[PDB]
Design a protein around this ligand. Structure first.
Ligand SMILES: Nc1ncnc2c1ncn2[C@@H]1O[C@H](COP(=O)(O)OP(=O)(O)OP(=O)(O)O)[C@@H](O)[C@H]1O
Ligand SMILES: [Mn+2]
Ligand SMILES: [Mn+2]
Ligand SMILES: [Zn+2]
Ligand SMILES: [Zn+2]
Ligand SMILES: [Zn+2]
Lengths: 97, 532, 84, 280, 171, 112, 162, 105
DNA sequence: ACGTCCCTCTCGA
RNA sequence: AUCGAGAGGG
C-alpha cells in the first residue's frame, strides 16, 4: 500500500522521526551507493570483492564515502544528471548559521 | 541485501547543485557512445560496443557489468557521453541564456553597464541571491552599445533587440541577424570572471558558458531499462538513438560537402532532439511523438507522481495491510482485531536474545502454516533461510544474535489507519489482537477521529520492523495518548450510538435493576472491586 | 563548540520525544544483546527491561539538545526529570 | 498548500517556533509556549461583574469592624483584627487584583470572561476539599502572612522560558502574565477562607499541584507545530464541505462565503469579491 | 624524516559492548586497525604513541541501527618517504639488474643502470654479490641510497633509488 | 495592524461553521505570512519562492525548473529541511530526531 | 573506516599534511615533528614500555632481542611493518642514552633550520659540508659551510660508542 | 520632516545631505492618525545597543528576525532606517501580552 | 499556474 | 509486463 504524501504529513505531526525513516527506507527503496569527496555524484567503481574504489576523472581512491538513500533519490539524481545539473551530495559542511 | 563495503558510512549534509562542465562529462565517463543500436551486435543477447553497456552496466540479470564487477543489485549505473557536432541550447536555460545576452556586449563580452551608474552600483551590491540578477537585467536590456569612457571601459559596438522565436535567438540592429550558438558561447566563454559572478553564476559549479551543451551525459540502463515484450528498450533509449541519428547526419554534413542551407536545418533538428529529450511540454512545438507524445525527463520528475510527489515524498511500503473494517463492543480502545491470514503473512524482525530464545525456537519449530509461526529466519551469514521449504527447518537450533522474522502476535505496536487521512488523530497506533474472519475490528469509540464506519470502509495497517520504531509508535502515536486533540484542545473521542443512545435510558431514576441482573453487570467490569 | 552545564537553560524536564527515543533506543540495544544494568525481575521484553532501567536512571545516555545557532546543552538521563 | 507551507515549523529548544533557516515565526509558540491538550476554558471572576460586589468577594480590610475576616473564617481572628503591618499586604493584594480587573478589560474588551488556559483551578479545589475533607464550620489555620505570600511565591516558580538575563525574563513575565490573573482571581485571600475553607496543607498542595500541572502544560521542544497547524485548520474545512449532502441544500454548506472565502485569504489577490468597510 | 601527526579514526561497536571496559576494547580496536598499516596521505602509520592518555570522546548512538560512533583522536609515529631523500640502509634482494634495500618498513630498489659504470654483476657467488674495483655489495651490507621516485601499492609503498651521484655507497 | 485583520478574517470563516480552533494554529499561519515585511502568500509563487531549501521547494507546484535555476545559480541546500530528508532517507530533525543521544563511560562505570 | 587527519621533491616540498604550519591536537598553530633515527628508536621503546606497564595493570647489538620480546608482547604479531622498524633503528641510530639526544636536539635547532634538516642532519653522519649539503640539498645557502661543519664536527664528537 | 499639503513632483534632492535623510509627509494621510487604531500595536524604537542585545540573547543573525518595511505606515511614523528594530508589544488572547520583534529594511 | 487522499476491478497497441 | 482510455469502491 502507498504511504503517501498525505501521511508523511500525519507522521511528521507525531514526531515519529525514525519510524518515518523506516517506512521510507527499510519498508521500500533503500540502497547503498558510493559517492565522492569531490564530485558529489554517485560515480565511483564499487569493485568491493577486492577493495578497489576508484573515481577516475577526479583521480582518487581515498576520499570515498557511502550512503543510505532511497533508490528513488538515486534515480532522481541520475535523472537530473542527464539534464546536466549535477546535484553533488556532501557529508562535510560549511554553513552552520 | 548488499555486500559489505569497507568505505566510511556517513549521511548527506549538503547538496551542492552545479552544472556539468562539458569536460567533467568527457571525464567521469567509462566508454564513448557512438552506435545507436541497443545490444544488437547480432540481435544476440550480448550487448554492443556503441550503446548500452560499453561499460555502462548490464541488462541481463545473469551477467555482470563490464566495469564495476558487481551484480546489478548494487551496480548503480555508469555514465558515458556523446560528443556533439555543434553546440546547442539547453531547453531549460534558454530564456536565461538570452537574459544574459540581454546583459553583456556580444562582441567583447563585458557587462553592458559596469561600476559607473547609480542603479548599477546599487544593483551590483544587492548581495541577495539572484534578485541582483533581475535588477541587473531590467537595467541593462536597454543600453544597446558599449562605451569609450563616458563621464574608460574599453569595446564600443552596439547590441541587438534579441528576441526568441522557438528554440533559436534573433537579433536586429537599427540589419536582422539570428544568434548562433557557436557565437553566443564564445561571448559567454569570453565573459569576464567578475561579470557572471555579480551577474548570477559561479566560478566552478555553474559557469554560464555551460548553459550551452557541448558534451552530453549518457544515463545508464537503470534510468531507461529494457523489458521482455526478445526485449524492448525504453522511451529514453529510443530518443537518444534519434539524437545520435540526428547528430551523426549533421556530423558529416559539416565535413565533406558543406552546403549552408543543409547544415542550417539538421543542427536545428539536432538541438530539437537534444531539447525534446529533456523538455517536451515546450511553448509552441509539435510535442514530438513516439509513433504515437514521448516521455521526457522533465515530465518524469513532474508533480502528482514522478520521483518528487510520487517516489520520495511518498512511496509504497512492504509490511502493509488492508480490509473491510467492522466494530467490536467487546474490545478495548487501544487494540485492533487483525485477522489470522494477515498475521500469518505479516512478519517482523526479532533478535535472538536469551530472554526469548526459549520462545523463538518454539515458533520456528512451529512454522508458517500455524498461528504463532515464522516465515523466515536470518543467520549471522545473513542469507535468507526460508522455513516454508528448507530441509533443516526441522531441527535448526538457533544461535544468539540471529533474527527470526516471526509472526505478528497479540499486543504488537501497529500503525493503524483510515484513508481520507489529513491529521494525526487519523494514524494512531494500536495493540494487536489476532482474530477470525477477514475483517479488521476496532472499538466503536475510535470511529470518529478516523471518521470511519462499518458499511464498506477498508483501513490500512503497518508494522514497525524494529524496536525503537515500536517505542516511537507506542510512546508517541498511541490511541490513549491522543485522547485529547490539540487542534480543538478538547477530547476527540467519546461514547456513541448504542452505548450513548441507552446510557440515558439507564441513567433515569425511572430506570431500575433487580437482584439477578445486577451481578451480571458488576462482573462485566474488568476492574471491579468485587464489593456489592 | 559546546555549552557548559553551569550556564544551561533548556527545559530541565525530559521531553516526550527525548524519553520515547531513550526508552526506544536502549530497548533496541538491549534486544541487540546488550549489557543490561538494572536487575531483571524477570523480563523477556526489552522495552520493559529498558523501562525499569528508566525508573532507576541506570541508563548511560546523554541527550545532546541542539540550539538554532548550532551549540548544544548535554543532559544526563541520570539528571533529567521525568513527569509527563 | 498549508502543510508544505508550515511543514518545517517546530518549536525549538529555546522556545522559538522557527523554520529551515533559523528565522523566528514566534518567540513563544501560542505566545504562551503552551501545549494545546493541557488547556481548558474557565472564566476569570476578576473581570465580569459589578464594581459593587467585586469588593464583596475580594476586598478584605483588617482596619474595620464590618469588612474584615470574622474569626469563624480563620484561627488568628481577633489577634489580627485591627493589625496593620498586614493590612499593607491585604492592600498590596487588593491593589494587584484591581490593577488586573482593568488589565483584562484592556485585552478582553468583549466583556468575555471564559477563556482557555493551563491548569483547571476551579477543579483542583474540590480536589483538595474532597481529598482532605473541609469543614465549612470550624475555621481555617492560615496566616494572612501565609496565603498572600504563598500565592506570591507560586508565581515565582511557574516557569516557561529559563534564562539568565533580563531580556528573556521580561519575555518570561509576559508569557505567564495572563495566567497569574487566573491565580489572584481564585487564590483570593478572601475567597480562599470565605468560599474555599482551606486548611494549611490543603492549600500548599493546591499550590504545588498547580505548579507541576503547569510545567506539564508547557509545549515540548520538538513538536512539529507547523505541519500540526495546517491539519488543524485544513481538516475542518474539508469536512465543512464533505458533508453538505446530509440535508438537502439549506445554507452555509460549502459554496457560500466560506471554503471559498478561505480560497481568497491564502492566495491574497486583490479582486476581493465582497469588500466592505464597517464604519463606526 | 620520520614524523608524528595527530590523526583520527571513527570506530563503532555493537550494543553488546557497552558495560565493561568499552575503552579497553575501543583502544585495542583502534590498534587492531591503525597499528601496522600504511597509506600515502600519512605514510607508514607505525606506532600509536601515549597509550593511556588517548581520547575516546562521547559516543554517538546511530539512528535506525543500535551501534555508536567514536572519533578517537590519537597521536602516533608516521613514516613517509619523499623523492630525493637519501636514506642509509641494508640490502635484502640481490638481482642481476639491481639490488633491493630494506629501509624502515618500506623497500627501496636500485638498478644496474643507476649504479655507476664499474659494477660488473656476478651471479656465480654464494650468496649473490655485485663486484667493482674495490667495493662489493652483498645480501647483508650497509649502503647509502638516494630515493628518486616513490609508488604506493596497497598496504605498503616501495621506491627506486640511486648510487651514481657522489657521497653514496661508501659505508 | 494587518496581522490581526488577516487573522480576524480567517477566524471568522472557521468559527462560522461552529467548529472552533485554538488561536495558536491560525496565529501560526498568519504570523507565517506577515513576518516577512508584507503578506506573502500560500502559493507556488507566494512563500515557495523563499530562500529556504531547494529540494524542500521542488516538492510544491513548480518542480523541475526549480532544480533548474538551482543547478545554474549554484544554489545550495542546507539539508535542515524535513523534506530534504524524506528525499534523502535520513531521519529528519523531527521530535524524536530533534536532538542526538550519546553514551558516557563515566556513567557506564558508575552503573557497571 | 579509515584514518583521518585535521587538514613534490627533497626541496622541502612536502604534502599538505607534512606542511610546517600543521594543527595541534588541541587546535593551535604548532610547529611540526621531524626527528632522527635515534630521536626515533627511543620514542617508540618508551612508548612501547608504557604500553606493557598498562596491560599488566589489568648495550651493543644486545638491544636487538630485548625489543623483539616487546613486539611479541606489547603489540601482537599482527604488525610485520613495525617489527622491522625497531630493528632498523637499533642498528642505524647513532645515539644510545637520552642525555646525548637532547644535546644533539639542543645544538640542532640553534641553527633554526627546517625540522627535516633537524631530522636528516642528525642521521646521515657527514664529514664535510660538501657531503653534508649534498645529501641534504636544501641547506645550500642557509648555513655557512664552516658553521655547518662546526656543528657537523660536534655531531662527530657525540657519537655513542656502540 | 517637510509636510506638503497637496502634491510634490520629482524635482529627488532629499537624499543628498549626508548625514541627514528627511521624511516628507502629506496632510491627506496626517489628518487621521493610524497609530490610535484599535489594531495598531505599540511599536517601540530599539537602540544600537538595544539591538545587539536581542541579537545575542535570542542567538540570531540579523536575517532571522521578522521584518517591517521602510514604508510601513508606522516605520515612517517613526522614520525607521534599515537595521533599526522595534518591539511591537500587544495584548494577546493567550499570553495576555505577547512581545514580538521586527527589524526594518 | 496547478488543480483532495487511497483502494478494487476491466481492456486496446 | 509498460504507457493510454474506461466504470465502481469508501
Ligand atoms: N470523494 C471522497 N473523497 C474523500 N473521502 C471520501 C470521499 N467519499 C467518501 N469519503 C470518505 O468516506 C467517508 C464517508 O463517506 P460515506 O459515503 O461512507 O459516508 P456516509 O455518511 O456513510 O454515507 P451515507 O451518507 O449514505 O450515510 C469519510 O471518511 C470520507 O472521508
Ligand atoms: Mn456510512
Ligand atoms: Mn462509509
Ligand atoms: Zn570527483
Ligand atoms: Zn557497473
Ligand atoms: Zn563590447
Amino acid at each position: 500500500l502507498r504511504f503517501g504524501e498525505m501521511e508523511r504529513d500525519c507522521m511528521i505531526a507525531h514526531g515519529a522521526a525514525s519510524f518515518l525513516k523506516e517506512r521510507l527506507m527499510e519498508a521500500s527503496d533503500a540502497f547503498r551507493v558510493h559517492i565522492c569527496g569531490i564530485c558529489g555524484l554517485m560515480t565511483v567503481i564499487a569493485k568491493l570483492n577486492h577493495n578497489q574504489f576508484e573515481c577516475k576523472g577526479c583521480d582518487n581512491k581515498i576520499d570515498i564515502y557511502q550512503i543510505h538513500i532511497p533508490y528513488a533519490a538515486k534515480l532522481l539524481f541520475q535523472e537530473l544528471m542527464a539534464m546536466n545539473i549535477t546535484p553533488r551530495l556532501y557529508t562535510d559542511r560549511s554553513r552552520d548559521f | 541485501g548488499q555486500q559489505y563495503s569497507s568505505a566510511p558510512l556517513r549521511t548527506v549534509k549538503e547538496v551542492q547543485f552545479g552544472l556539468f562542465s562539458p569536460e567533467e562529462v568527457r571525464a567521469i565517463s567509462v566508454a564513448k557512445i557512438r552506435f545507436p543500436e541497443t545490444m544488437d551486435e547480432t540481435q544476440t543477447r550480448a550487448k554492443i560496443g556503441g550503446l548500452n553497456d560499453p561499460r555502462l552496466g548490464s541488462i541481463d540479470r545473469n551477467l555482470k557489468c563490464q566495469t564495476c564487477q558487481e551484480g546489478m543489485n548494487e551496480c548503480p549505473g555508469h555514465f558515458g557521453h556523446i560528443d556533439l557536432a555543434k553546440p546547442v541550447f539547453h531547453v531549460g536555460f534558454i530564456a536565461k541564456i538570452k537574459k544574459v545576452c540581454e546583459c553583456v556586449c556580444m562582441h567583447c563580452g563585458k557587462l553592458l553597464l559596469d561600476e559607473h551608474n547609480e542603479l548599477m552600483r546599487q544593483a551590483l551590491a544587492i548581495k541577495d541571491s539572484k534578485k541582483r540578477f533581475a535588477a541587473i537585467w531590467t537595467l541593462c536590456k536597454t543600453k544597446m552599445v558599449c562605451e569609450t569612457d563616458v563621464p574608460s571601459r574599453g569595446c564600443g559596438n552596439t547590441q541587438p533587440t534579441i528576441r526568441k522565436d522557438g528554440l533559436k535567438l534573433v537579433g536586429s540592429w537599427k540589419e536582422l541577424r539570428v544568434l548562433s550558438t557557436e557565437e553566443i558561447l564564445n561571448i559567454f566563454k569570453h565573459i569576464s570572471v567578475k561579470d557572471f559572478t555579480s551577474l548570477g553564476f559561479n566560478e566552478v559549479f555553474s559557469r554560464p558558458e555551460w548553459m550551452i551543451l557541448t558534451c552530453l551525459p549518457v544515463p545508464p540502463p537503470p534510468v531507461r531499462p529494457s523489458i521482455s515484450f526478445q526485449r524492448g528498450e525504453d522511451d529514453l533509449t529510443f530518443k537518444l538513438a534519434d539524437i545520435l541519428k540526428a547528430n551523426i547526419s549533421l556530423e558529416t554534413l559539416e565535413h565533406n560537402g558543406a552546403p549552408h542551407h543543409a547544415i542550417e536545418e539538421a543542427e536545428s533538428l539536432l538541438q530539437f532532439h537534444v531539447a525534446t529529450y529533456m523538455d517536451n511540454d515546450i511553448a509552441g512545438q509539435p510535442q514530438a511523438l513516439q509513433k504515437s507524445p514521448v516521455k521526457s525527463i522533465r515530465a518524469r520528475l513532474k508533480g502528482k507522481e514522478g520521483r518528487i510527489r510520487g517516489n520520495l515524498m511518498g512511496k509504497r511500503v512492504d509490511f502493509s495491510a488492508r480490509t473491510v473494517i467492522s466494530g467490536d463492543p467487546n474490545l478495548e480502545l487501544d487494540q485492533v482485531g487483525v485477522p489470522k491470514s494477515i498475521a500469518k503473512t505479516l512478519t517482523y524482525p526479532e533478535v535472538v536474545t536469551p530472554y526469548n530464545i526459549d520462545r523463538l525456537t518454539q515458533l520456528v519449530r512451529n512454522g508458517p502454516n500455524e498461528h504463532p509461526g515464522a516465515k523466515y529466519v536470518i543467520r549471522d551469514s545473513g542469507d535468507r533461510i526460508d522455513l516454508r521449504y528448507s530441509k533443516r527447518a526441522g531441527d535448526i537450533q538457533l544461535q544468539y544474535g540471529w533474527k527470526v522474522e516471526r509472526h505478528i502476535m497479540d499486543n504488537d505496536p501497529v500503525l493503524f489507519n483510515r484513508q481520507p487521512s489529513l491529521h494525526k488523530m487519523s494514524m494512531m497506533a494500536h495493540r494487536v489482537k489476532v482474530i477470525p474472519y477477514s475483517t479488521f475490528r476496532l472499538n466503536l469509540s475510535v470511529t470518529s477521529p478516523y471518521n470511519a464506519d462499518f458499511d464498506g470502509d477498508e483501513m490500512n495497517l503497518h508494522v514497525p520492523q524494529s524496536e525503537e520504531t515500536r517505542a516511537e509508535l507506542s510512546q508517541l502515536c498511541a490511541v490513549p495518548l491522543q485522547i485529547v486533540s490539540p487542534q480543538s484542545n478538547k477530547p476527540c473521542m467519546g461514547i456513541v450510538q448504542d452505548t450513548l443512545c441507552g446510557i440515558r435510558k439507564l441513567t433515569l431514576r425511572d430506570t431500575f435493576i433487580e437482584l439477578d441482573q445486577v451481578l451480571n453487570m458488576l462482573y462485566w467490569v474488568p476492574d471491579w472491586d468485587g464489593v456489592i | 563548540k559546546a555549552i557548559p552545564k553551569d550556564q544551561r537553560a533548556t527545559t530541565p524536564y525530559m521531553t516526550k520525544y527525548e524519553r520515547a527515543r531513550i526508552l526506544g533506543t536502549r530497548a533496541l540495544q538491549i534486544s541487540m544483546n546488550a549489557p543490561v544494568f538494572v536487575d531483571l525481575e524477570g523480563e523477556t521484553d526489552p522495552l520493559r527491561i529498558a523501562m525499569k532501567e528508566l525508573a532507576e536512571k541506570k541508563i548511560p545516555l546523554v541527550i545532546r539538545r541542539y540550539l538554532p545557532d548550532g551549540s548544544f546543552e548535554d543532559w544526563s538521563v541520570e539528571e533529567l526529570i521525568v513527569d509527563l | 498548500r498549508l502543510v508544505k507551507a508550515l511543514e518545517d515549523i517546530m518549536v525549538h529548544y529555546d522556545n522559538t517556533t522557527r523554520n529551515s533557516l533559523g528565522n523566528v515565526i514566534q518567540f513563544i509558540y501560542g505566545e504562551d509556549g503552551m501545549d494545546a491538550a493541557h488547556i481548558e476554558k474557565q472564566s476569570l471572576d476578576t473581570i465580569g461583574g459589578s464594581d459593587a460586589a467585586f469588593e464583596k468577594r475580594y476586598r478584605v480590610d483588617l482596619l474595620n469592624t464590618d469588612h474584615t475576616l470574622d474569626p469563624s473564617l480563620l484561627e488568628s481572628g481577633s489577634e489580627i483584627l485591627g493589625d496593620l503591618k498586614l493590612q499593607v499586604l491585604l492592600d498590596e493584594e487588593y491593589k494587584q487584583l484591581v490593577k488586573d480587573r482593568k488589565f483584562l478589560r484592556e485585552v478582553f474588551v468583549d466583556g468575555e470572561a471564559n477563556w482557555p488556559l493551563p491548569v483547571n483551578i476551579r477543579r483542583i479545589i474540590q480536589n483538595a476539599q474532597q481529598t482532605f475533607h473541609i469543614d465549612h464550620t470550624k475555621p481555617s489555620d492560615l496566616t494572612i502572612k501565609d496565603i498572600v505570600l504563598g500565592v506570591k511565591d507560586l508565581q515565582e516558580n511557574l516557569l516557561v522560558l529559563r534564562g539568565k538575563n533580563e531580556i528573556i525574563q521580561n519575555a518570561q513575565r509576559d508569557a505567564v502574565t495572563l495566567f497569574c490573573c487566573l491565580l489572584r482571581s481564585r487564590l483570593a485571600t478572601r475567597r480562599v477562607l470565605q468560599e474555599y475553607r482551606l486548611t494549611k496543607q490543603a492549600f500548599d498542595w493546591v499550590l504545588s499541584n498547580i505548579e507541576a500541572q503547569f510545567l506539564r502544560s508547557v509545549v515540548h521542544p520538538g513538536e512539529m507545530v507547523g505541519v500540526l497547524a495546517a491539519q488543524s485548520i485544513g481538516e475542518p474545512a474539508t469536512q465543512m464541505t464533505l458533508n453538505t449532502f446530509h440535508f438537502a441544500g439549506v445554507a452555509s454548506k460549502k459554496v457560500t462565503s466560506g471554503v471559498p472565502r478561505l480560497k481568497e485569504i491564502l492566495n491574497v489577490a486583490k479582486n476581493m469579491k465582497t469588500p466592505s468597510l464597517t464604519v463606526y | 624524516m620520520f614524523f608524528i601527526k595527530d590523526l583520527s579514526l571513527n570506530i563503532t561497536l555493537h550494543p553488546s559492548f557497552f558495560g565493561p571496559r568499552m575503552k579497553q576494547y575501543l583502544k585495542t580496536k583502534l590498534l587492531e586497525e591503525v597499528e601496522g598499516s600504511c597509506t600515502g596521505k600519512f605514510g607508514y602509520i607505525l606506532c600509536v604513541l601515549d597509550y593511556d592518555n588517548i581520547d575516546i570522546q562521547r559516543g554517538r548512538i546511530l539512528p535506525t541501527d543500535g551501534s555508536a560512533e567514536f572519533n578517537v583522536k590519537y597521536r602516533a609515529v608516521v613514516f613517509k618517504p619523499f623523492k630525493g631523500e637519501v636514506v642509509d640502509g641494508t640490502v635484502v634482494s640481490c638481482s642481476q639488474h639491481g639490488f633491493e634495500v630494506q629501509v624502515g618498513p618500506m623497500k627501496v630498489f636500485v638498478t644496474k643502470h643507476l649504479m655507476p659504470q664499474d659494477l660488473t654483476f656476478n651471479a656465480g657467488s654464494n650468496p649473490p654479490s655485485y663486484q667493482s674495483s674495490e667495493d662489493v655489495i652483498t645480501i647483508k651490507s650497509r649502503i647509502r641510497v638516494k630515493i628518486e621516485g616513490c609508488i604506493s601499492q596497497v598496504s605498503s609503498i616501495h621506491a627506486i633509488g640511486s648510487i651514481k651521484e657522489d657521497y653514496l655507497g661508501a659505508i | 495592524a494587518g496581522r490581526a485583520a488577516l487573522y480576524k478574517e480567517v477566524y471568522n470563516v472557521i468559527a462560522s461553521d461552529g467548529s472552533y480552533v485554538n488561536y495558536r494554529h491560525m496565529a501560526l499561519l498568519v504570523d507565517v505570512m506577515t513576518t516577512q515585511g508584507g503578506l506573502t502568500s500560500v502559493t507556488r509563487h507566494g512563500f515557495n519562492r523563499s530562500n529556504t531549501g531547494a529540494l524542500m521547494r521542488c516538492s510544491f507546484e513548480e518542480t523541475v525548473e526549480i532544480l533548474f535555476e538551482a543547478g545554474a545559480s549554484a544554489e545550495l541546500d542546507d539539508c535542515r529541511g524535513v523534506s530534504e530528508n524524506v528525499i534523502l532517507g535520513q531521519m529528519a530533525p523531527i521530535g524524536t530526531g530533534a536532538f542526538d543521544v550519546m553514551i558516557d563511560e563515566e556513567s557506564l562505570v558508575k552503573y557497571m | 573506516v579509515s584514518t583521518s587527519t585535521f587538514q613534490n621533491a627533497a626541496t622541502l616540498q612536502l604534502g599538505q599534511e607534512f606542511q610546517l604550519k600543521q594543527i595541534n591536537h588541541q587546535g593551535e598553530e604548532e610547529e611540526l615533528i621531524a626527528l632522527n633515527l635515534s630521536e626515533a628508536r627511543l620514542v617508540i621503546k618508551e612508548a612501547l614500555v608504557e604500553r606493557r606497564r598498562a596491560f599488566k595493570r589489568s648495550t651493543r647489538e644486545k638491544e636487538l632481542e630485548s625489543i623483539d620480546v616487546l613486539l611479541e608482547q606489547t603489540t601482537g604479531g599482527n604488525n610485520k611493518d613495525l617489527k622491522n622498524t625497531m630493528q632498523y633503528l637499533t642498528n642505524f641510530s647513532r645515539f644510545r642514552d637520552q642525555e646525548t639526544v637532547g644535546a644533539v636536539i639542543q645544538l640542532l635547532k640553534s641553527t633554526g633550520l627546517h625540522p627535516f634538516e633537524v631530522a636528516q642532519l642528525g642521521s646521515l653522519a657527514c664529514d664535510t659540508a660538501d657531503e653534508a649539503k649534498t645529501l641534504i640539498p636544501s641547506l645550500n645557502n642557509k648555513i655557512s659551510d664552516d658553521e655547518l661543519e662546526r656543528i657537523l664536527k660536534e655531531l662527530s664528537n657525540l657519537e655513542t660508542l656502540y | 520632516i517637510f509636510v506638503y499639503q497637496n502634491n510634490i513632483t520629482p524635482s529627488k534632492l532629499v537624499p543628498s545631505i549626508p548625514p541627514a535623510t528627511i521624511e516628507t509627509f502629506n496632510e491627506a494621510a496626517l489628518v487621521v492618525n493610524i497609530t490610535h487604531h484599535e489594531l495598531v500595536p505599540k511599536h517601540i524604537r530599539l537602540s544600537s545597543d538595544e539591538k545587539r542585545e536581542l541579537l545575542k540573547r535570542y542567538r540570531l543573525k540579523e536575517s532571522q528576525l521578522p521584518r517591517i518595511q521602510r514604508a510601513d505606515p508606522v516605520a515612517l511614523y517613526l522614520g525607521l532606517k534599515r537595521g533599526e528594530v522595534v518591539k511591537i508589544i500587544r495584548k494577546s488572547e493567550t499570553s495576555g501580552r505577547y512581545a514580538s520583534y521586527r527589524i526594518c529594511m
